[PDB]
Design a protein around this ligand. Sequence first.
Ligand SMILES: Nc1nc2c(ncn2[C@@H]2O[C@H](COP(=O)(O)OP(=O)(O)OP(=O)(O)O)[C@@H](O)[C@H]2O)c(=O)[nH]1
Ligand SMILES: Nc1nc2c(ncn2[C@@H]2O[C@H](COP(=O)(O)OP(=O)(O)O)[C@@H](O)[C@H]2O)c(=O)[nH]1
Ligand SMILES: Nc1nc2c(ncn2[C@@H]2O[C@H](COP(=O)(O)OP(=O)(O)O)[C@@H](O)[C@H]2O)c(=O)[nH]1
Ligand SMILES: [Mg+2]
Lengths: 430, 430, 432, 48, 51
Amino acid sequence: MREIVHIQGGQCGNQIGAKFWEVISDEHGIDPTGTYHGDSDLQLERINVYYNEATGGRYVPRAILMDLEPGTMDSVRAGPFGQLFRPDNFVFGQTGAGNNWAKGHYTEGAELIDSVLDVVRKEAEGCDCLQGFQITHSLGGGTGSGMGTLLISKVREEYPDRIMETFSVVPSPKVSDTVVEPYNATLSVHQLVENADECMVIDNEALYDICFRTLKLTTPTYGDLNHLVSAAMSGVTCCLRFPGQLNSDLRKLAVNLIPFPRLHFFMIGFAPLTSRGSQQYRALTVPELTQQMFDAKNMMCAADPRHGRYLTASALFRGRMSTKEVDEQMLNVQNKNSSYFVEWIPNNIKSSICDIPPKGLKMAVTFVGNSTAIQEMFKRVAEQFTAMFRRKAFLHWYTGEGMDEMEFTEAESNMNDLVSEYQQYQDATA
Amino acid sequence: MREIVHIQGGQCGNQIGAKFWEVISDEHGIDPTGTYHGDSDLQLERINVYYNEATGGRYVPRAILMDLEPGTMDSVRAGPFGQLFRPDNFVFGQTGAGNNWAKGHYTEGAELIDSVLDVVRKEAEGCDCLQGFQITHSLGGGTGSGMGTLLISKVREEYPDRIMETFSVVPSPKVSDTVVEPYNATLSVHQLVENADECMVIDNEALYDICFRTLKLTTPTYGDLNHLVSAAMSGVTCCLRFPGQLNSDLRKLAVNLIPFPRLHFFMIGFAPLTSRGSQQYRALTVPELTQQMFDAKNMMCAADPRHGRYLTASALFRGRMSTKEVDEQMLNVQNKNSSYFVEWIPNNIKSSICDIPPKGLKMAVTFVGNSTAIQEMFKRVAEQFTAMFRRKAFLHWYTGEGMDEMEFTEAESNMNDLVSEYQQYQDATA
Amino acid sequence: MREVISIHVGQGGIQVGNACWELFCLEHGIQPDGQMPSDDAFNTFFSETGAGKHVPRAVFLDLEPTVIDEVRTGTYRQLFHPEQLISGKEDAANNFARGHYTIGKEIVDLCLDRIRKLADNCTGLQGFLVFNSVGGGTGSGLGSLLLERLSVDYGKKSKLGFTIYPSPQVSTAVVEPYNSILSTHSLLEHTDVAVMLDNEAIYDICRRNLDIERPTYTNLNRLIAQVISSLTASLRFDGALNVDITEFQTNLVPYPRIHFMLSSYAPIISAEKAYHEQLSVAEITNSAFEPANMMAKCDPRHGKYMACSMMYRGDVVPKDVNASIATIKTKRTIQFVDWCPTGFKVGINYQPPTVVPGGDLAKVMRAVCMISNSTAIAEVFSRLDHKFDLMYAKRAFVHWYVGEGMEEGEFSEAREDLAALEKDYEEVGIET
Amino acid sequence: ADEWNAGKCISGEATLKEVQTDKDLGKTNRFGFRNITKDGDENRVFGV
Amino acid sequence: GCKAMYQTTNNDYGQPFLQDNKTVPTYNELVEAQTEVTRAEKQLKNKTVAT
Ligand SMILES: Nc1nc2c(ncn2[C@@H]2O[C@H](COP(=O)(O)OP(=O)(O)OP(=O)(O)O)[C@@H](O)[C@H]2O)c(=O)[nH]1
Ligand SMILES: Nc1nc2c(ncn2[C@@H]2O[C@H](COP(=O)(O)OP(=O)(O)O)[C@@H](O)[C@H]2O)c(=O)[nH]1
Ligand SMILES: Nc1nc2c(ncn2[C@@H]2O[C@H](COP(=O)(O)OP(=O)(O)O)[C@@H](O)[C@H]2O)c(=O)[nH]1
Ligand SMILES: [Mg+2]
């Protein structure tokens, strides 16, 4: 009933999707063998949203794994919860991308996209009434941003009314990992804005800061960073799988958060997060949930939310709490801090309540906010691109595969167009 | 009552027939020594279709083995299930045809066929009420290609109102094992189209592709290919040998599949087929069975359905299932692929339901399709034929045994006429 | 004293006949072996053997032995007469010419001899009930032949045909529009009453009321059997307003050429959602006129009504029917033809319907079955006419028919008869 | 210088739960529209 | 994994009656016994999970 199909691509996307199915299965009580072993009945009413039933009584997720190199998928199949995935859903190349956007979108991706698009269609027609797609990928690589944006563009043609979700791990200057990040990142934004309906940017810089300072663990790893993304992603669609006071699926979030069609880039956050040695001293109440919710350091992005004005924010409350107290906190924040909220839209905060909290927790909140402060991330990416593009450095590989510098100029202008248009609503007055 | 006799010629035909008899004996519960040890009443309910009862209570197949070389004959005699056949039915020459259609159709075939026609007449007059003939042969080998078609001509001359079936393996371009192959292929087709009521075409390359992609077998062999062909063959007479909701026989299939007298060349396929690794991840349902059925990669032929339009198609379903589901699936696929279906005949799909699934499976499907895309094989064969015939290469072997170039010209003209008239209805519109 | 003979031909007719005889045995308590453990209502369908068992008054006819051998090996072997199960060797195989010119000629002699051996035993014969699916070889081939022979051998005996016409958009065969029209020519002037029983309507009924998303043919056949029992229920059961078979064509047929009608049934509910509604007479009669509840895929709102013969079985009170019928006339969406002021022929019976053990239906105090004649039935003849013209324009599938002994020009008369029938419906429907 | 799958994988294993027919033919497994009556009244006529 | 965590709202609609009709406490004792009720409310969490 209103199912959603999940597609993960690239090295980073597979790692994000590897831990996502670990969290969901534990929430629904599914072992590595796919046999239900839960305790409460509520875990089975809407289990078909994410899982398909197979003959013999085991549940197989509707997940599609795609890459140009078999290195990462051979690692994910041998790990725990790696037997759930249908063996026919693995699609791979044999050449790799090498952080070359043209290779993953024009030369190599163009000849493999036909095979993966077929299995995408097969899962979609299997569902009774499709709700939409959710994609996990990274914008700093070839195979990630190459076929990732290609696949969304193709999917939009055959499903023009279904929704689309993307969780983009975009690069940050402080945590540098590739010398050609600005090139392929600004190219993907050009094509991503035209097709996707919901995009939620994530920076490794923010995840490293929240682990070291908030969670206060000495030696973090990619497993811990992937864990924080999994909890936030599952909290977005939690109300679609469990009963609650106010139901709000992904379509309802898009309507209330998107004032204009080109402004669909959000930044997310999850609460509560506490250290291992200080969880006894805190109190789990709505007032303390919301104060950490609005913390600038709790966001999953390098952008500082106090440098701009919020356009519209969404809060998904999990657990049992009084509805009056939830709204009273929301109204109180908007009044005491009138300088940080856009004024020509009255009551620009959305509240949703669901009855089922995450396993091992009493209360939780997932925060999604469309804020004008996100322009800073596009500003810094633009500076690095134009500085390096002026000397035409590292360019002949992008132009050596049938692509021309004309597309480069168009992409930077369009991303410049987005930044200027995105800012001018911050200065707008009634 | 309404029984059929089986006759096989050539090495490939003999292998196909041996594996078919093994499959039929396993399905009917007949041991290799000819004694009945079945477990269900329906196993013995209609055993008279394929077997004869002799003194002592043992069953012998009504199969007639013909050849010009005793090597494969002795091999199949010493192989497993080689004791079922009556020793008298073995008729063979002592010289061989040497892959020469002229040698197999004029020199030794004319002098040898008297005895095999005598035994065929004996079986046909011995059976209570003949239903038809089915013949397994290949169009590449000289002895099969010639003697089989001469025997088809004689049998049609002597029994006008019965049905004739031929399961023929036509030449493939990529997998070639003979150099004079197009010549005797065209010569066989010219005689076959005139007399054979039905013709079913198989490709070794198509079988290799199926077993390597769908089945994911590392080392396929002729045993596996013959097993696939035998299952697809037994699927046709399943409904004649077992009860069902909508029973259908060979004459029913012929009437519902053949619009025009010379358009009687079909392609077949079998479902379900899954690898051992993905065996437990699949769910057996009518929608997925029809999806695999209409998948072009499941066809036993290299011809691509997307290169033509279907005239008529048939789907024999085995197992207990609802009729409304099958009818709705057929209507849905016909409406979804309306551009791929000829438009001047409404509802060009025939469905039959049988209540006995194959041993080991809860459900199974056999597909017989008459589509305009089959002209490609004749096009390629005629191209090779004319390329070799423009230089008169290898022609002295055929001209030194009674034939002349006018017969070759007539055969080429007839093949071209078949191709043109078969393509006419593809673009014919109402 | 009153008897009817049942003729079953073709797989479609046989596979619904055995379901009907299952229902008839339950109504009279006759065990499947034929004996009765512990007044003569059964006499209309059964005949006493003299000591013990009761045998059905029906003859099974087919050219293929698959279905007949299923009955002979089934648990109903001991019920039917061993030599009343006539079977052939070669199938007709969707070919009308085979069943009417080649193979059906050698079997019709055997069936008429048995029917003669069955009519002399009966003394107050009422008529014939013949079951056949039109869109088939032996169903249309033999069915046409039996109708022709019976009409001259017996004459004035009323013949009722329960035919199953092909569905509008879904079908099993591909050439059935050909042999549907060919049999249409035969049955027009040789059967008194014909009933439309396509499969699409019955599929929708199971999906909405009984909520059966994947029904098999047996569910369809059980529902058909209930209608037949209701129609005959006034013959073998005492009632307040009894109706005889001869009192159908006098009250349902305006003109001799107009005798095609479609049926409806109500209530059709499961045994768990029956607790939540009272099944009053006022609402069961309203569900009968629901266009989605018609047994034929036709929308009655597209045409007028000529007459309606609707029967209640159970504990209905005569005053209740008049109150319900008066509301129908006051309704505007249901309009009758101008030259027929009263159009309701209503009968009341004291025999509530029975239910087979393990069946889908639930047992209730009231049920209504309808046979209605309306002008809206003109659509179905047009849609098959459209399909036939598409294929015949290029003579597809014709070489199979001309080669079996039938003239090529016979298709002209068959097509021209349907056009004549359409001209009658459009002519009668206009006002005066 | 080939496991048990040598064309036998067309019909292999298929434990007893797989082979049994579908999940429901000609019956509704929905709670509200099912056919079974409760224990209290194994047979009662469904009207007024 | 706690079983009490899965209890949800909209189950708060009518559900029996904890206190039966035949053992209604008098008004006098309800006033008198508020000392333990307040005492139980304050330290219930302190002796169960705080230890
Ligand atoms: N309602 C219903 N219709 C059936 C059933 N079985 C077959 N039919 C109808 O019969 C039509 C095809 O004819 P068949 O009954 O299969 O075969 P036949 O009537 O015996 O005629 P032949 O082809 O000569 O065997 C189909 O289009 C169905 O609509 C059934 O069990 N119930
Ligand atoms: N959160 C997270 N990020 C990762 C992981 N692996 C790689 N990344 C990020 O992905 C970026 C490099 O992406 P890349 O591997 O080139 O993407 P690809 O081209 O699709 O393979 C780096 O900046 C990393 O921060 C992971 O396991 N978890
Ligand atoms: N499927 C299948 N094809 C075979 C087999 N043996 C031979 N063939 C095919 O038959 C063709 C040669 O035919 P040939 O044996 O000369 O026919 P013959 O002269 O009548 O015996 C080759 O192209 C093979 O592909 C077999 O066991 N199975
Ligand atoms: Mg039949």
